[PDB]
Amino acid sequence: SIVKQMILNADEEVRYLTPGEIHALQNFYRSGTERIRLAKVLAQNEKKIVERATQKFWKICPRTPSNSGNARKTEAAMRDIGWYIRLVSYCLLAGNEKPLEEIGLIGMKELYNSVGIPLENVRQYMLCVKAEVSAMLTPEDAAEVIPYFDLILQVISSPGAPYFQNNGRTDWQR
Amino acid sequence: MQDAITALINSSDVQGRYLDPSSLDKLQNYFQSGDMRAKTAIAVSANAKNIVTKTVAKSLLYTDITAPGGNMYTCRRYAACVRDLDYFLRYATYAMLAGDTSILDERILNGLRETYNSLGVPIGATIRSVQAMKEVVTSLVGADAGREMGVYFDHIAAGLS
Amino acid sequence: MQDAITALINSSDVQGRYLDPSSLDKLQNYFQSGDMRAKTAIAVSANAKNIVTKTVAKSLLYTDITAPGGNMYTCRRYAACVRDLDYFLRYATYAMLAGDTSILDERILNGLRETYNSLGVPIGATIRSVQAMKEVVTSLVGADAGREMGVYFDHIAAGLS
Amino acid sequence: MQDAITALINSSDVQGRYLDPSSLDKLQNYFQSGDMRAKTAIAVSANAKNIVTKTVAKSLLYTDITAPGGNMYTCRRYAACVRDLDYFLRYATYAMLAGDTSILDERILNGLRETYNSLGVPIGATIRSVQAMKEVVTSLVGADAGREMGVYFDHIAAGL
Amino acid sequence: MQDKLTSVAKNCDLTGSSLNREVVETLKEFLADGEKRVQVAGVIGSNAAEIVKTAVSLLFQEYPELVSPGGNAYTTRRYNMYVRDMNYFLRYCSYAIVAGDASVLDERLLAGLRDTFNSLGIPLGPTARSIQLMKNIVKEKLVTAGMTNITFVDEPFDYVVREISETEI
Amino acid sequence: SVKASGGSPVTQPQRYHTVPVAVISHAVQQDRCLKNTELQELADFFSSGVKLLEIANTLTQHADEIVLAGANRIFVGGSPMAYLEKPKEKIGLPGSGYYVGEDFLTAARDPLPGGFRFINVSRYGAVRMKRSMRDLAWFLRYITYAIVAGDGSILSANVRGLRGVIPEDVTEATIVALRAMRRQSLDYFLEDAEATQLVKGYFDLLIAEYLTDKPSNQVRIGVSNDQQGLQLPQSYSMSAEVRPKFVFKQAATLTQKQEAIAAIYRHVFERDVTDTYGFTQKAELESQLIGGNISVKEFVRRLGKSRLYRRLFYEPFTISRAIELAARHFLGRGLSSREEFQTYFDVMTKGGLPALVDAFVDSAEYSDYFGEETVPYLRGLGQEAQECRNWGPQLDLFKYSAPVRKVPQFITLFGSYQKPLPEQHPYGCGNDPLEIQFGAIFPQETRNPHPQPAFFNKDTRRILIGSGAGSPDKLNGNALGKVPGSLGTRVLKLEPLHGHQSPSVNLLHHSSPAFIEGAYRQVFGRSLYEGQRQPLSSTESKLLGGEISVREFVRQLAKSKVFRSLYWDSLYVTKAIEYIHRRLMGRPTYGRQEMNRYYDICATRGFYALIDAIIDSPEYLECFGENTVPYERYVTARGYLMRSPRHENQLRRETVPDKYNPRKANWAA
Amino acid sequence: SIITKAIASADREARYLSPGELRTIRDFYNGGENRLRIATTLIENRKEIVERGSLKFWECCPDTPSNSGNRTYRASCLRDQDWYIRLIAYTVIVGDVEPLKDIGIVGVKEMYESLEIPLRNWVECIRCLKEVTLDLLSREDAAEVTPYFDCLIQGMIP
Ligand SMILES: *[C@H](C)[C@H]1/C(=C/c2[nH]c(/C=C3N=C(/C=C4\NC(=O)C(CC)=C4C)C(C)=C\3CCC(=O)O)c(CCC(=O)O)c2C)NC(=O)[C@@H]1C
Ligand SMILES: *[C@H](C)[C@H]1/C(=C/c2[nH]c(/C=C3N=C(/C=C4\NC(=O)C(CC)=C4C)C(C)=C\3CCC(=O)O)c(CCC(=O)O)c2C)NC(=O)[C@@H]1C
Ligand SMILES: *[C@H](C)[C@H]1/C(=C/c2[nH]c(/C=C3N=C(/C=C4\NC(=O)C(CC)=C4C)C(C)=C\3CCC(=O)O)c(CCC(=O)O)c2C)NC(=O)[C@@H]1C
Ligand SMILES: *[C@H](C)[C@H]1/C(=C/c2[nH]c(/C=C3N=C(/C=C4\NC(=O)C(CC)=C4C)C(C)=C\3CCC(=O)O)c(CCC(=O)O)c2C)NC(=O)[C@@H]1C
Ligand SMILES: *[C@H](C)[C@H]1/C(=C/c2[nH]c(/C=C3N=C(/C=C4\NC(=O)C(CC)=C4C)C(C)=C\3CCC(=O)O)c(CCC(=O)O)c2C)NC(=O)[C@@H]1C
Ligand SMILES: *[C@H](C)[C@H]1/C(=C/c2[nH]c(/C=C3N=C(/C=C4\NC(=O)C(CC)=C4C)C(C)=C\3CCC(=O)O)c(CCC(=O)O)c2C)NC(=O)[C@@H]1C
Ligand SMILES: *[C@H](C)[C@H]1/C(=C/c2[nH]c(/C=C3N=C(/C=C4\NC(=O)C(CC)=C4C)C(C)=C\3CCC(=O)O)c(CCC(=O)O)c2C)NC(=O)[C@@H]1C
Ligand SMILES: CCC1=C(C)/C(=C/C2=NC(=C\c3[nH]c(/C=C4\NC(=O)[C@H](C)[C@H]4CC)c(C)c3CCC(=O)O)/C(CCC(=O)O)=C2C)NC1=O
Ligand SMILES: CCC1=C(C)/C(=C/C2=NC(=C\c3[nH]c(/C=C4\NC(=O)[C@H](C)[C@H]4CC)c(C)c3CCC(=O)O)/C(CCC(=O)O)=C2C)NC1=O
């Protein structure tokens, strides 16, 4: 959380929190009710967002482990997406991205390499999830929540799309 | 020495490209401001002696700097301080006309601190005098042209500090 | 500077004694190699500009150094690099004639590194250019004289690092 | 650090072409000489102390630099000179095994002139010592192996 | 490193003019654009990988010899270094946009950059071109997001170019 | 803004691994000759080199067939080999003799994966097709390179992370093509079972490493808020040379423990100096390490506090240089910022050298990198992401000549980063002579090196302190200058001469020998020896008879062989230019404009043309005319300060009380 | 400042500024105008603050070098009081103790021990100045200003 980060920074330098850090903490405390409301909103819309995002993702990328005819793989993919939405809600509550980093971002690429899931498929799935979250939430709620999904995407966005050394045609598949 | 146009041309030339629309817009801004720059140069040239007189009066006179044992004591050192203020005013006017601070980097601030420390010239008093000169010039040429000249006065002062 | 004969003379002179038989043998070796040194000097003098042209073509052309924004970009910087290469070739010929690298240390290398660092000249690129020049000279002259000149080219390259 | 194979691969790769017959011939010569190069590396590793002893005896002992006021005076500076000679021999062996002089340019000549000039070590005496070491190595490991070691000995000497 | 407010506050004591009218006016002008600076930084951070990828692809389009044999972007090792360094530049430019001051660029990006690039043979022309491409892409994204007065976004990138490019005139 | 430069060391980063390079690098970093096992490895590699060359030649001769086999497996609806661009030889380069004279006209005359979809050549585009074909040919070429090098590193470092750089849409296709190529390659031996094994291994390594999906960058987290965090792609680490890391284990045999201890000595002392200096107390420390009482961390801490470390890396150096060296010895890296130097300087001021050693060893960074059992090792280029701010200083610190430089290299650069251009010659501090009466005294680059280059552009103009010398008529424009040791109005001037013999006693301000000696003392800085004036006697006569002016006499003096030997023959060219300019013009050059002009004159025509250019300059005529011997008119800041060593007049330090009954409380009982 | 602290924290981890840090920075940029108004109030009233506080300080701490009959000592003490009031105003502009700490808290004990000026007398003077300042500020503005006085006092206590 932000309070934990301030305390760790102060303890590293062996000093009490400065007045500015205390004022930032007070602002964070004052924003707590709105943060909790946003987290509740995200929690209540988890299942429908996941379902719609899965539909869009299967429409986009069919050649995926979650669309290989295995029910276990489909359940696991939907569960992973729900987990990432849950971590984003944790970030909303905590005031920073540390829950996301410490639960689902550090080592995420290594985990998916070991499990066997292509990370571009994960990126496309998360883009679909971000689109669904933007569609469902109000513009303010989206403006507050989407940055964490963009933070997730930034981890698994390189190397990859876009590609510009082409003629722009996508029908070359044959 | 580079002015605004030469700086834009240099930035485009290292890339081997013609001036992009952003640099062309900057060039048009410089051309539009050229008339005000010429007017400010004329105004500062017409009042250079008075500007330096007021700067010395409001920042250096009747202090311990002009007293015996001060760095502006004796006529030679007083004249040298006035000459230095003339230098700063003239080169700030040059930089304002060019729209670029490179002239101050290459001809004013290079080795200025070492030279002043070698001679014993007070750096803080020089910075305060430059601030006073900026205030005088702003009162003389107005708020907008005053701020434009103050950009280069502040560049000199920041280089001295 | 100082050549082979002067080097042996000074080695004997710091001890205050005549040249010992080993120094006499070294002097005889230099005297016998003088003919080859003169022929190599003639060959390098005849084709100096061609040698530098081949060096630039081999090591510098069509690289990012001559591209816009590079250090050999613009005609003045290209000509300055060519001038430095001409200096290197002429002084390598001098050192080969003298049989000693003393002139290279005195005239070329004592301050070249700091000068290049101040100018932003890529030292790795100029070392590669000097090695390419050594290759060009050894192709023009021969193997034995090419190796003799490459001794001093290698000394220049080592002094540049 | 770069060996002959790296140099040839890089020269072919800069122009984006496979190994032409000239580069294949150079690589073949390097590989075929590798047997005797490893043999003489073994011999030098076995006789490094003797090589340095003979070199010092025939190039530095009983001269002015050993008498008081010389740079090899005091046991500390004698040991430092012997250590420098060992360094030169070991890195010459490295450069021979690599078939390239990059190791010498990277870890010997890079800062050698500055070190010797700041400490006052005479360059000429060091050059004579390196020459004596080259002669001793040639007499120990044979004619051709001695010559291909002397190439790198001369590279070190010309670097100074 | 310092941000705009810290530098202005310290200069208030340094120059001896204290909190006069010009300082107050500059502070008010800077604080007027603070929310836009935060928004610009958020946009840059949310699209960093896309910006860097687009800029590097356009750079290789305008410098096709860079990826050819003998080029500096030749092989995936050097390609990855290109992407890494462009990410460095974008990150520190976003920092400078937030702070409103170029001291972060001076202390953590440009100090010794020329020495490193001369040591490694990194060409400065393509570096400036890639920085300008990233700047153009960021401006396009900001216009797409609906931002209007985003002149300050030009300041870091251009500045960095002026600091790394060689003197031609 | 950032004009200070730490210099650009010549670095040659490793791009891939070769068997000889790997073996020799491992031997080098341990400071010992090749082992028997390593020599055996080298011999085995060399004896097999002919077979590797034959394999690579076989693959090269059939490169078109192999690439065609790869391309035909994935491309349909076109001819892929039409898009394969071969390298083009650069013929007719300048100086090649291709064109004689200025005449240029006569020179001429395996099952596919499930659901695999092929790629339509026409719809894929020319750009992408050329990309693909060059990629296949490049893969084959690097496979032959790996075969010759004896190491697949050139593949692994260049295909890990390639997936995604090559579009993710075609990664599967790429694999298919590679496998096809592999098949074709294996069709070209079919009789060895060893060459086939090698080709199979290299192709499998390429496929396996290419299949890695977005490998994570190695992050270097800043150790404090004054240090930046960085990232290094895995390819850079893989291609770089390998650090042999030693881990001390109490269960290891005595020989392995002694090897780790030798590594500790080689790192902390830059060399195993323990035997040379009679470090007998080492034995006790070694026991405390071998028995497991203390760790490598405590062993290094005790080594840093030993008398040997103090003798080697504290006594010869100042506090700043000692801190800079201890950074390398206890952290394997140089100092990052001036704030880090400030903290370590405060630590050293408070507690001394043991406190500094404790601050280094007890830091979280030490335990992060070396923990308790790992021997400290040198970090740097290729081991982790490097900073630009300490690039040059750290590269120079890692060299063996680091303990030979006494002037600090980090705090000076870190201080000058925050400052404008220094007061120095545009070509560096080594191009500034001592401003003395005579003698060209310059800082030698290789002796006590302290060069501080700065990025002076061609238009910088130096600030000079006027000396105030000159005749009263040639004053009042720059009369505000005053420099100690200046003979103000004592300039040497000789009015030109205009059928009867002269009187016996005719007196000028200076007698003819006195004026000639003054001219010699100004041009040469000092009086010459007895016979040295012999070559110029006729010139002196022409000056006494009015044939030539003082300007021509000065020009002839500066053109003499004595002047050339004193100030040109054994001087760096621009150092000679600067000194001759100071002697003849009376001032240092302003900047790179004059320096470049005179350097070009020296390069094209030589020394005499340089003398002519200086003497014939309009400024020389303005300042000295035809009848005045030159004199010193400007000095630098340092030259001015060297002539002003007394400041007792400015230390005058800094009455009736202003309060009645001071230092008393109100309403005291 | 908090902007600089956030940028340094992000830089250490080689990451862009996170949404939470950006929200914090936006909040302080929003509060900048209020902090500027408070600092302007401090600056415009600095002479009365120093006058009243110095009179109170010489009442409560008479055995101090400034209150000893030396005109130079008294002038320097008053100059220092004005200096610290202005520094507190500037650090209020910034919004964090960093400028005031960098200019006049780090090494203040060493500087005034070299000058042979008791640091407890300085603590008493800063207490008097803080009381006088709090007399002319609202509680909300005092919540912004007082912690910098307290930081200075803590940095001055031996
Ligand atoms: C009196 C005969 C004439 C005159 C004089 C006048 N002077 C001032 C102010 C200053 N005078 C000096 C003089 C000197 N500084 C030096 O270093 C030396 C050499 C040792 C001298 C002679 C200076 C420095 C000042 C500035 C004030 C200060 O004390 O720092 C004034 C006052 C001008 C003003 O108030 O602006 C006057 C009037 N005036 C006459 O009418 C006489 C002809
Ligand atoms: C006046 C505001 C302050 C002051 C100044 C002072 N300066 C000098 C002497 C010199 N000033 C310079 C500066 C420059 N020369 C240049 O060419 C340029 C660039 C255009 C600059 C900035 C120099 C070189 C000198 C040395 C002497 C000379 O004129 O050549 C003095 C006299 C120092 C002496 O005793 O020699 C003084 C007093 N002093 C103050 O106290 C003011 C705050
Ligand atoms: C065309 C009008 C004439 C001509 C051209 C020609 N050029 C080259 C090669 C080079 N040209 C340059 C030019 C410049 N470099 C600079 O920095 C500037 C200032 C902006 C200029 C004009 C350079 C550096 C080269 C070298 C190659 C490189 O770019 O690295 C050639 C040589 C081609 C070859 O390799 O043989 C030629 C022929 N030829 C004509 O017939 C015209 C008269
Ligand atoms: C060519 C191989 C490389 C190259 C060179 C280059 N040099 C300059 C400019 C200068 N070089 C020198 C060096 C010397 N000074 C000496 O005394 C000697 C020995 C006689 C040498 C070799 C000097 C003095 C200059 C003058 C700088 C000036 O313009 O005043 C340049 C021009 C740099 C500029 O900024 O204009 C260049 C390009 N650069 C390369 O990239 C080649 C690898
Ligand atoms: C006599 C007690 C023992 C003995 C000695 C011995 N020494 C040499 C030759 C040399 N001795 C030295 C000694 C020193 N150099 C120093 O700097 C110092 C410190 C002050 C000392 C003690 C050196 C350098 C030499 C080399 C020759 C020279 O002096 O130039 C020899 C001859 C070696 C040879 O093979 O020529 C001998 C025999 N030998 C014994 O058996 C005694 C126990
Ligand atoms: C012996 C042939 C001559 C000699 C040498 C001498 N050297 C030193 C000191 C040093 N020598 C080096 C050289 C290197 N160290 C390395 O690691 C490498 C690369 C492998 C090299 C080339 C160094 C670094 C030093 C300084 C550290 C040290 O003292 O060990 C000395 C001592 C100098 C002193 O006064 O301290 C000497 C005497 N001197 C001669 O006269 C011989 C001709
Ligand atoms: C004699 C007591 C000792 C001695 C002296 C010595 N000096 C030189 C050469 C130079 N001496 C100087 C000194 C000065 N430069 C100045 O400007 C002044 C003030 C007027 C002085 C005193 C300089 C610059 C030189 C350099 C050469 C020159 O003459 O220009 C030498 C010659 C050294 C050489 O290698 O040329 C000597 C021998 N040496 C001793 O051993 C005596 C104890
Ligand atoms: C080890 C040797 C090596 C190789 C081969 C390599 C490949 C490589 N292929 C690239 C691009 C590319 N490569 C391909 C295509 C393909 N590539 C294939 O191997 C397939 C056969 C084919 C698809 C069927 C395309 C389409 C691009 C351009 C991607 C873009 O749009 O950016 C790039 C990016 C640079 C550029 O765009 O020019 C690299 C570095 N890198 C290396 O270091
Ligand atoms: C935060 C400030 C900072 C910078 C900028 C920086 C740059 C930097 N770029 C490097 C590499 C590299 N950088 C590039 C390429 C380029 N680089 C560019 O900025 C261009 C876009 C492109 C050329 C046009 C390449 C090709 C390499 C590898 C060089 C090699 O082949 O060894 C390296 C050496 C490897 C390392 O240790 O990371 C450094 C230090 N380091 C820093 O700390």
Side-chain angles (χ1 to χ4, degrees), chain A residues 45-58 78 125 132:
Chain A
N45 299 328
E46 170 208 13
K47 169 175 281 295
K48 219 170 296 175
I49 279 173
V50 160
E51 289 172 353
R52 296 186 317 177
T54 313
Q55 297 177 4
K56 295 281 178 66
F57 173 65
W58 286 343
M78 299 181 71
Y125 209 141
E132 291 322 301

Side-chain angles (χ1 to χ4, degrees), chain D residues 102-136:
Chain D
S102 280
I103 177 72
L104 295 184
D105 283 339
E106 189 186 53
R107 285 186 188 259
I108 305 296
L109 305 186
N110 202 6
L112 185 48
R113 184 68 91 166
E114 151 189 347
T115 294
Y116 275 10
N117 288 349
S118 302
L119 295 176
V121 179
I123 309 285
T126 316
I127 294 310
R128 295 187 56 235
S129 310
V130 170
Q131 286 317 289
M133 208 162 46
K134 174 180 87 167
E135 291 286 324
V136 170

Side-chain angles (χ1 to χ4, degrees), chain G:
Chain G
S1 76
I2 284 301
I3 323 296
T4 317
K5 280 204 205 49
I7 290 176
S9 287
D11 193 7
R12 278 185 63 166
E13 312 186 41
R15 64 164 167 80
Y16 293 76
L17 283 162
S18 76
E21 304 176 318
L22 286 166
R23 165 83 69 234
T24 307
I25 288 156
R26 180 191 68 84
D27 286 1
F28 277 174
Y29 276 163
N30 291 343
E33 302 267 25
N34 197 66
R35 291 191 316 266
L36 180 53
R37 169 198 61 97
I38 296 165
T40 300
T41 289
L42 283 177
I43 282 302
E44 296 307 313
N45 295 284
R46 66 184 162 92
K47 279 186 254 191
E48 294 82 46
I49 285 166
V50 164
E51 192 177 3
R52 294 204 264 260
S54 68
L55 287 166
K56 279 163 60 44
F57 157 68
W58 291 324
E59 274 176 347
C60 76
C61 192
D63 191 10
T64 200
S66 61
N67 202 53
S68 86
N70 199 333
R71 331 188 93 93
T72 308
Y73 288 0
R74 178 172 254 114
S76 296
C77 187
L78 292 174
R79 188 208 61 218
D80 287 8
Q81 294 179 53
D82 183 75
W83 207 336
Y84 271 116
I85 290 312
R86 288 188 287 103
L87 285 179
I88 286 159
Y90 307 148
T91 202
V92 161
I93 282 168
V94 160
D96 210 353
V97 81
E98 302 300 318
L100 165 74
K101 188 182 70 69
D102 295 331
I103 294 175
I105 298 188
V106 181
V108 63
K109 285 193 292 287
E110 286 84 60
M111 174 178 92
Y112 281 122
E113 285 169 349
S114 179
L115 282 168
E116 294 187 335
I117 296 160
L119 271 305
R120 300 205 187 279
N121 298 357
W122 257 115
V123 173
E124 295 292 272
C125 180
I126 299 306
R127 288 246 164 75
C128 294
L129 289 174
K130 180 180 91 82
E131 200 175 20
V132 171
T133 295
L134 263 49
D135 270 332
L136 57 98
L137 279 178
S138 66
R139 278 266 293 174
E140 186 179 358
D141 299 348
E144 300 269 315
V145 173
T146 306
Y148 305 125
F149 275 100
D150 292 322
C151 285
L152 182 57
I153 279 162
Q154 276 306 292
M156 272 166 168
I157 288 170

Side-chain angles (χ1 to χ4, degrees), chain C residues 20-134:
Chain C
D20 55 1
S22 63
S23 286
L24 290 177
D25 276 337
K26 293 181 183 179
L27 197 71
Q28 187 66 78
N29 292 358
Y30 174 72
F31 279 141
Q32 286 178 353
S33 78
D35 174 66
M36 179 265 306
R37 287 173 198 284
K39 262 139 59 175
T40 312
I42 293 158
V44 172
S45 306
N47 317 283
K49 289 197 178 297
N50 181 242
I51 282 160
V52 172
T53 285
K54 291 176 80 176
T55 298
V56 174
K58 188 143 82 177
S59 72
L60 293 158
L61 289 196
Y62 293 107
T63 70
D64 53 8
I65 303 168
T66 51
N71 197 237
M72 275 189 73
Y73 190 55
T74 85
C75 302
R76 77 189 196 267
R77 296 214 285 268
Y78 191 111
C81 184
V82 171
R83 166 179 65 194
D84 284 11
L85 286 172
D86 285 309
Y87 250 109
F88 294 154
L89 184 60
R90 197 161 41 86
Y91 272 85
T93 313
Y94 288 162
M96 181 268 304
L97 267 171
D100 208 355
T101 74
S102 176
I103 176 157
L104 288 177
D105 277 319
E106 287 288 334
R107 308 300 298 290
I108 304 302
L109 302 183
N110 185 25
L112 195 44
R113 273 192 286 126
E114 196 188 14
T115 297
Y116 276 170
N117 288 336
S118 300
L119 301 170
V121 170
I123 297 180
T126 198
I127 289 175
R128 291 193 322 261
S129 296
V130 168
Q131 289 157 358
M133 177 175 276
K134 168 179 77 169

